[PDB]
């Protein structure tokens, strides 16, 4: 419908421009009729989600690369795709013009975008605030008669959530994670520093702070908004080191597990809300196997925790066989989410690269290695920046998706957005992973799912400076001949009949 107005700023690709009078934004989605395939195309050179249409064909031959579907090869179903309001990307939202606005919700929240349905809300200030609180900070309040939202809830996070929720024809998902406890509920007094809930799981402070959850769950519903789940903590190894720069509150494993076997678990079971999902560790996946084994083998812990969610920092290397792949063997019932992801943190990168291509393939390979290990959904954090990476009040700033301009009434979405999208757009709710076999060695990076409605779709990544011939084989359908030129990013789509 409208395409990408292309800006360099001197990386390897482009941003698209948005304003207060243009966005670029699909047509309301639709299948082509059966034989047909759909592909939508990025690639390095500046090309944006753009759809071609080609035939499914009855033959093939040739010594080429096949991908066959393996549809009754079945792995994970999939909760979906989002991103994180935190205060930082709310003040940025609502920094620009109210059409300007409009046109970044509908870019992330509607059909005519990318149709994320998760959104992550932090409970009370990050490091992505620029005012340090929380909902509960007069002192020695256990049985929290002062819980209150202030003005970055109800003013700024609430009303764009509702925005989003308005725009969005697929149901939305929200997940809750704190940051920290009220100080007087930590052993050092501070929101920052190492320090854990004074006391013992089953006291009277870690009741006050599970109740606390409860209280936030209650508010967020007097302004009729629900949750799908919350997380035990943001980081629960973080509060465990000297110095840490900014909101925190440390659990080991062992803390963890008994703060939801006595406190959180029961707290949540006995409440109205009840039937939002518990995720535990919402941590890197350095510490898999090894929580998850500490936290699920308590048969008391585990009967509360419906998943583990995991961060993925892109700057840096880590195993993912040995961590995801060997928890996924050893609780192969117990799901696994990606809570939160972002790219940009390292000191001496700069937090914003306006057009980054690399950036981009960075979140669709993270993305396609999530679900190759079984992972069911993927949430990227802040949902939009301005220049410089922030607002953050220690200045830990980093990229995201959307950067804002204020003083142009602009807002750029980067090349992490349209890599994200060539799986939120094309993945709905529901969907399950099937598997996808390659007739032989090559560099691509792909992945294969079925839609709640039969239909494919396969979303293919080339890292590699080359263009690749290939093949896909549905074999209850035929043949998709095509192309992954290099430095692309292709989304097939097409309906199956048997
Ligand atoms: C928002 O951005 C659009 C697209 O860049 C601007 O419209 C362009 O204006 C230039 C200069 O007049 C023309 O050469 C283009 O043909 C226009 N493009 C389109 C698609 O209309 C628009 O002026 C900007 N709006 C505001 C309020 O600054
Ligand atoms: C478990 O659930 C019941 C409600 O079904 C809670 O009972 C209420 O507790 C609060 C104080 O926490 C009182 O102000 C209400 O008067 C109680 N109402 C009823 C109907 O009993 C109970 O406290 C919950 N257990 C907890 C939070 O540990
Ligand atoms: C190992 N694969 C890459 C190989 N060239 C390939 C491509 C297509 C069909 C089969 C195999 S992969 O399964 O696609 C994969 C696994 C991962 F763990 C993370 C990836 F990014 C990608
Ligand atoms: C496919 O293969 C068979 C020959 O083996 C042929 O009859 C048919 O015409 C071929 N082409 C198409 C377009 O089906
Ligand atoms: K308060
Ligand atoms: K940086």
Same mark, same amino acid.
């Given at each position: 419908?409208?395409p990408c107005?292309?800006?360099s +700023?001197?990386?390897?690709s482009?941003? $698209?421009?948005?304003?207060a009078?243009?966005?670029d934004?699909?047509?309301?989605?639709?299948?082509?009729?059966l034989?047909?395939?759909?592909?939508?195309?990025?690639?390095?050179?500046?090309?944006?989600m *753009?759809?071609?249409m080609?035939?499914?064909?009855?033959?093939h031959?040739?010594?080429?690369?096949?991908?066959?579907?393996?549809?009754?090869?079945? !792995?994970?179903?999939?909760?979906?795709?989002g991103?994180?309001?935190?205060?930082?990307?709310?003040?940025? =939202?609502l920094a620009?013009?109210?059409?300007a606005?409009?046109?970044?919700?509908?870019?992330?929240?509607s059909?005519e975008?990318?149709?994320?349905?998760?959104?992550?809300?932090?409970?009370?200030? $990050? #490091?992505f605030?620029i005012?340090?609180?929380?909902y509960?900070?007069?002192?020695?309040?256990?049985?929290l008669?002062?819980?209150?939202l202030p003005?970055?809830?109800?003013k700024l996070? =609430?009303?764009? =959530?509702?925005?989003?929720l308005?725009?969005?024809?697929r149901?939305?998902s929200?997940?809750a994670?704190?940051?920290?406890?009220p100080?007087?509920?930590?052993?050092?007094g501070?929101?920052?520093?190492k320090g854990?809930?004074?006391?013992?799981?089953?006291?009277?402070?870690?009741?006050?702070?599970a109740?606390? !959850?409860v209280?936030?769950l209650?508010?967020?519903?007097?302004?009729?908004?629900?949750?799908?789940?919350?997380?035990a903590?943001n *980081?629960?190894s973080?509060?465990?080191?000297?110095?840490?720069?900014?909101?925190?509150?440390?659990?080991?494993?062992?803390?963890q597990?008994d703060?939801?076997?006595?406190?959180?678990?029961?707290?949540?079971?006995?409440?109205?809300?009840?039937?939002?999902r518990?995720?535990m560790?919402?941590?890197?996946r350095?510490?898999?196997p090894?929580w998850?084994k500490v936290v699920?083998?308590?048969?008391?812990?585990?009967?509360?925790?419906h998943? =583990?969610?995991?961060?993925?920092?892109?700057?840096?290397?880590?195993?993912?066989?040995?961590?995801?792949?060997?928890?996924?063997?050893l609780?192969p019932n117990?799901?696994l989410?990606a809570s939160?992801? $972002?790219?940009?943190?390292?000191f001496? *990168?700069?937090?914003?690269?306006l057009?980054?291509? #690399?950036?981009?393939?960075?979140?669709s390979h993270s993305?396609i290695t999530?679900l190759l290990?079984?992972?069911?959904?993927?949430?990227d954090?802040?949902?939009?920046?301005?220049?410089?990476?922030?607002?953050n009040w220690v200045?830990?700033?980093?990229?995201?998706?959307?950067?804002? #301009?204020?003083?142009?009434?602009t807002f750029?979405?980067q090349?992490?957005?349209?890599?994200?999208?060539?799986?939120?757009? !094309?993945?709905? *709710?529901?969907?399950?992973?099937?598997?996808?076999v390659?007739?032989?060695?090559?560099?691509?990076?792909?992945?294969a799912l079925?839609?709640p409605?039969?239909?494919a779709v396969?979303?293919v990544?080339?890292?590699?400076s080359?263009d690749?011939?290939?093949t896909?084989?549905?074999?209850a359908v035929? +043949?998709?001949?095509?192309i992954?030129?290099?430095?692309?990013?292709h989304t097939?789509?097409?309906?199956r009949q048997?």
């Amino acid at each position: 419908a409208r395409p990408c107005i292309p800006k360099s +700023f001197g990386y390897s690709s482009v941003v $698209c421009v948005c304003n207060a009078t243009y966005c670029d934004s699909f047509d309301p989605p639709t299948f082509p009729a059966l034989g047909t395939f759909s592909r939508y195309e990025s690639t390095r050179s500046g090309r944006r989600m *753009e759809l071609s249409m080609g035939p499914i064909q009855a033959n093939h031959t040739g010594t080429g690369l096949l991908l066959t579907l393996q549809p009754e090869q079945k !792995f994970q179903k999939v909760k979906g795709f989002g991103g994180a309001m935190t205060d930082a990307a709310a003040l940025n =939202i609502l920094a620009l013009s109210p059409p300007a606005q409009n046109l970044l919700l509908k870019s992330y929240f509607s059909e005519e975008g990318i149709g994320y349905n998760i959104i992550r809300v932090p409970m009370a200030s $990050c #490091d992505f605030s620029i005012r340090t609180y929380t909902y509960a900070d007069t002192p020695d309040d256990f049985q929290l008669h002062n819980f209150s939202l202030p003005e970055e809830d109800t003013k700024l996070k =609430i009303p764009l =959530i509702h925005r989003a929720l308005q725009l969005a024809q697929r149901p939305v998902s929200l997940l809750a994670s704190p940051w920290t406890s009220p100080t007087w509920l930590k052993t050092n007094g501070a929101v920052n520093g190492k320090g854990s809930l004074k006391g013992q799981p089953g006291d009277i402070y870690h009741q006050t702070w599970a109740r606390y !959850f409860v209280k936030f769950l209650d508010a967020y519903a007097e302004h009729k908004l629900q949750f799908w789940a919350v997380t035990a903590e943001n *980081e629960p190894s973080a509060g465990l080191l000297s110095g840490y720069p900014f909101q925190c509150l440390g659990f080991t494993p062992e803390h963890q597990r008994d703060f939801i076997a006595r406190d959180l678990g029961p707290t949540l079971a006995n409440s109205t809300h009840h039937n939002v999902r518990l995720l535990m560790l919402d941590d890197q996946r350095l510490l898999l196997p090894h929580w998850a084994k500490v936290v699920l083998t308590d048969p008391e812990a585990a009967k509360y925790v419906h998943g =583990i969610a995991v961060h993925w920092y892109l700057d840096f290397l880590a195993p993912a066989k040995a961590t995801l792949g060997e928890t996924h063997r050893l609780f192969p019932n117990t799901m696994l989410f990606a809570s939160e992801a $972002c790219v940009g943190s390292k000191f001496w *990168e700069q937090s914003v690269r306006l057009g980054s291509w #690399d950036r981009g393939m960075q979140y669709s390979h993270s993305i396609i290695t999530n679900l190759l290990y079984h992972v069911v959904g993927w949430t990227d954090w802040n949902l939009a920046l301005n220049p410089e990476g922030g607002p953050n009040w220690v200045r830990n700033f980093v990229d995201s998706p959307i950067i804002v #301009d204020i003083t142009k009434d602009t807002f750029y979405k980067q090349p992490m957005f349209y890599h994200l999208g060539h799986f939120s757009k !094309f993945i709905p *709710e529901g969907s399950q992973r099937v598997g996808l076999v390659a007739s032989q060695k090559n560099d691509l990076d792909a992945v294969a799912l079925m839609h709640p409605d039969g239909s494919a779709v396969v979303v293919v990544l080339n890292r590699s400076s080359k263009d690749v011939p290939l093949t896909i084989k549905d074999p209850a359908v035929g +043949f998709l001949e095509t192309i992954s030129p290099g430095y692309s990013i292709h989304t097939y789509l097409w309906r199956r009949q048997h």
